[PDB]
Design a protein around this ligand. Structure first.
Ligand SMILES: *[C@@H]1O[C@H](CO)[C@@H](O[C@@H]2O[C@H](CO)[C@@H](O[C@@H]3O[C@H](CO)[C@@H](O)[C@H](O)[C@@H]3O)[C@H](O)[C@H]2NC(C)=O)[C@H](O)[C@H]1NC(C)=O
Ligand SMILES: *[C@@H]1O[C@H](CO)[C@@H](O[C@@H]2O[C@H](CO)[C@@H](O[C@@H]3O[C@H](CO)[C@@H](O)[C@H](O)[C@@H]3O)[C@H](O)[C@H]2NC(C)=O)[C@H](O)[C@H]1NC(C)=O
Lengths: 52, 49, 262, 49, 52
């Protein structure tokens, strides 16, 4: 349900997996700020900053 | 008991900010002119007044 | 693991008096104090988050604090919270701290510096707890009743609470200008800075390298570091960046919970 | 009314709408400073308690 | 009361204590404790650190 410009992806699997923050923090936070109103915000927060 | 929420202020350097109304409980907004704020490193807004 | 604290940064705000009656921009500034638990525990917000290292790794000994657009580290000992008397620190995570204090008319928090200097902040706060029941006792007995009450627990799980975060504003600084002879030099090191000089033709913009204007003195230029990679906080003492706001969310630890007291 | 029982009213715990009458006002910032002042009547649930 | 104390040369504490009723009140019409971030300026007095 989360949206990136013209992507409209499910929030479990944003297209930045893996290491969204590590590859580009700027873009990850700019995208994650755009989705504060969506109910699936916290799942996207969990998936955006979790990698090994 | 209530809770007053106060966001961070918006400062424009050589500009004017136009007050925008919105539907919040007991909402309040104002714009003040001629500010020259200082921060720890110095004063930003080259613009004098 | 999860580590939400890798997108968040400590910040510098204003403290009205720093333990000496004078004001300065301090890294230990106190935001709201919450006292909505019946046993009489408080939740203070720092501006320096405690329990994580400079290098972002969890640690029970290191605490993070801002030092002039550069993040420094301090030892968990020497964290003192006090009122008229002296408080007992129960919890510790992020910006938040838990303590039980004697009645008083203010409270201050303080930590050591890297140079072993005390940095503090006190605020006026009227604390007068009253225990639940029909008696105003001070200490629990070895024989008594159990009456229900509430506190803050030490769980740091999903909490259903909010903090608004946002990108920090462009911090101004004037230590980066050097005038040699009719030319200016701007220092570097991994920080892209903005400049606006009223000398000649169009010479504004951002940079990651030294240059020489060769024209004017330092009375016309300035530097604003634009560290823009990680969230800080939505604090009334630091300005915003853009007109319609950007915003974010982070859960806070220590939720309110049901217990019984004697 | 502000400062008394029921300064803020909500029709149910889950209800989305809220009535708030707490006399919140804003003031100019002091010169060379960034802090959003305000004055606002203390809670009426606390006062009633 | 108040006392003043210091360590000795042999690392012993030496103290002296007197009875003194201390009850300061700020200048103005409110009995506050800590200065606020927003208020008035009222003239007062102090002892300076100059030794001239
Ligand atoms: C870099 O700093 C300079 C200040 O030296 C900024 O220039 C200032 O820009 C504002 C807005 O364009 C000017 O205000 C204008 O004033 C004229 C009257 O002369 C009025 O007709 C306009 O409607 C507007 O109010 C301001 O005068 C000007 N300062 C000077 C000395 O000319 C510049 O904006 C800064 N650059 C950036 C990117 O922020
Ligand atoms: C301390 O314990 C009391 C007593 O249980 C808590 O009050 C109760 O909290 C529960 C939370 O689930 C409430 O249940 C709710 O009921 C509504 C009914 O419309 C339902 O729609 C919700 O989904 C939810 O299940 C309950 O109403 C509430 N009040 C009672 C039982 O009188 C209190 O929250 C506890 N305090 C804490 C945990 O800090």
């Amino acid at each position: 349900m989360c949206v990136l410009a013209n992507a409209t992806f499910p929030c479990f699997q944003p297209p930045c997996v893996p290491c969204c923050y590590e590859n580009n923090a700027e873009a990850t936070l700019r995208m994650l700020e755009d989705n504060v109103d969506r109910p699936g915000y916290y799942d996207l927060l969990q998936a955006a900053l979790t990698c090994r | 008991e209530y809770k007053t929420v106060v966001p961070s202020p918006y400062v424009k350097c050589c500009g004017a900010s136009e007050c925008s109304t919105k539907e919040k409980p007991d909402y309040q907004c104002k714009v003040y002119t001629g500010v020259y704020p200082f921060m720890w490193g110095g004063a930003y807004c080259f613009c004098d007044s | 693991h999860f580590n939400v604290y890798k997108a968040t940064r400590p910040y510098i705000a204003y403290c009205a008096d720093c333990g000496a009656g004078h004001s300065c921009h301090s890294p230990v500034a106190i935001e709201a104090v919450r006292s909505e638990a019946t046993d009489g525990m408080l939740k203070i917000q720092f501006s320096a988050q405690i329990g994580i290292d400079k290098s972002d790794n969890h640690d029970y000994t290191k605490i993070r604090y801002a030092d002039g657009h550069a993040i420094e580290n301090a030892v968990r000992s020497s964290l003192k919270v006090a009122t008229s008397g002296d408080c007992f620190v129960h919890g510790t995570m992020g910006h938040f701290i838990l303590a039980k204090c004697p009645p008083g008319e203010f409270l201050q928090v303080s930590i050591q510096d890297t140079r072993n200097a005390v940095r503090a902040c006190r605020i006026q706060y009227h604390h007068d707890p009253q225990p639940v029941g029909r008696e105003k006792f001070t200490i629990r007995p070895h024989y008594g009743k159990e009456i229900p009450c509430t506190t803050y627990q030490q769980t740091t799980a999903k909490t259903v609470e909010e903090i608004d975060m946002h990108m920090p504003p462009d911090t101004p600084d004037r230590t980066l200008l050097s005038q040699q002879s009719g030319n200016v030099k701007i220092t570097v090191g991994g920080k892209k800075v903005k400049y606006n000089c009223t000398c000649g033709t169009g010479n504004v913009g951002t940079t990651n390298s030294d240059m020489t204007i060769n024209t004017c003195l330092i009375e016309q230029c300035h530097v604003s570091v634009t560290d823009h990679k990680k969230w800080q906080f939505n604090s009334p003492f630091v300005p915003r960046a853009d007109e319609p706001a950007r915003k974010g969310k982070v859960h806070i630890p220590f939720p309110l919970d049901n217990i019984t007291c004697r | 009314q502000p400062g008394r029982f029921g300064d803020i009213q909500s029709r149910t715990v889950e209800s989305n709408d809220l009535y708030a009458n707490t006399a919140l006002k804003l003031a100019r910032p002091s010169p060379g400073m960034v802090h959003v002042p305000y004055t606002q009547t203390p809670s009426g649930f606390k006062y009633w308690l």
